[PDB]
Write a protein that binds this DNA or RNA. Sequence first.
DNA 1: GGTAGACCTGGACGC
DNA 2: GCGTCCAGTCTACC
Length: 314
Amino acid sequence: GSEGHRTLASTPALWASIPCPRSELRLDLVLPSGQSFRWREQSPAHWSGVLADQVWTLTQTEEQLHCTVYRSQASRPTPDELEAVRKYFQLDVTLAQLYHHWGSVDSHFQEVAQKFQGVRLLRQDPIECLFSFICSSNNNIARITGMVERLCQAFGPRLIQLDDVTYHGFPSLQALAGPEVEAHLRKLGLGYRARYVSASARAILEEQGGLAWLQQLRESSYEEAHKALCILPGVGTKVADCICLMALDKPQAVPVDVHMWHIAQRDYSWHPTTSQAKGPSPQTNKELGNFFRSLWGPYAGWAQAVLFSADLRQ
DNA sequence: GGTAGACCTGGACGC
DNA sequence: GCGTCCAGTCTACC
Ligand SMILES: Nc1nc2c(c(=O)[nH]1)=NC(=O)N=2
Ligand SMILES: [Ca+2]
């Protein structure tokens, strides 16, 4: 009862609610869709993970978003802690207004958005986002998720233990820059990305001015931010866009991957026009990104998550 | 400036 | 069962 992962039903007195209609958020579509790789549905309809250096389990009813925190006597999430949840899911942004707009300007979006509502963008931590996506290239969500777990367990602070699951905070820059980190990461199966992780942690801390340099990009322009990130090892056009969209408040950033190319070709009959290549290339990928922005507007990155997410269901 | 491989890993085909 | 295919970044020519 007092042990293991909690459920709304099993530990009633231990959950606080946040008004949130499923029309504004569908956890089952946001948490396992490749935005963040640290949430697990440990029990049906309940998702557990680390949010703001604390462990949480979240579940939702038709109109409520139920939250519970494990921190020292077990209490309820305070309205302050709940605020941390509101910021993570950027609940101030009205998903219904964006959907309305996108659907208005894009008949196909309208058609798809009808079956996949509640897909919004999480506002992630720069460091976690950076290395998680460095791990994402030329890889599948299943592996990435495992890789990111082993990584946090090996270099991240130990938080708390539920059942046989020990949660860890995300590794720090200093830890990731440590000696023999790449070697360790390889035995952990990160493949060649093991080097990227080490090299980018080192480069940030020893050549760019550390954490402040990264956090500063949030106030910077999208074009500036994306440009800066490309500097780092293992960070190409897509990874950079993922970071700008999900961690740097650059809502118009559109990550162009294999998924978005398929969608573009199949659902909009798109073809590169200012480029000679007919397939993915640095030129055509940049163009496709412009195409979606021109299609959905300032929040192109968010609209993207809707179709991307719905494309995963296949 | 603009392209062909090379690079870890492992679930998913296909024969 | 074994050999592909598939889920981006980087680099060596052209
Ligand atoms: N275009 C995208 N590429 C992604 C992604 C996402 O939400 N959009 N998650 C991910 O791991 N790769
Ligand atoms: Ca590919």
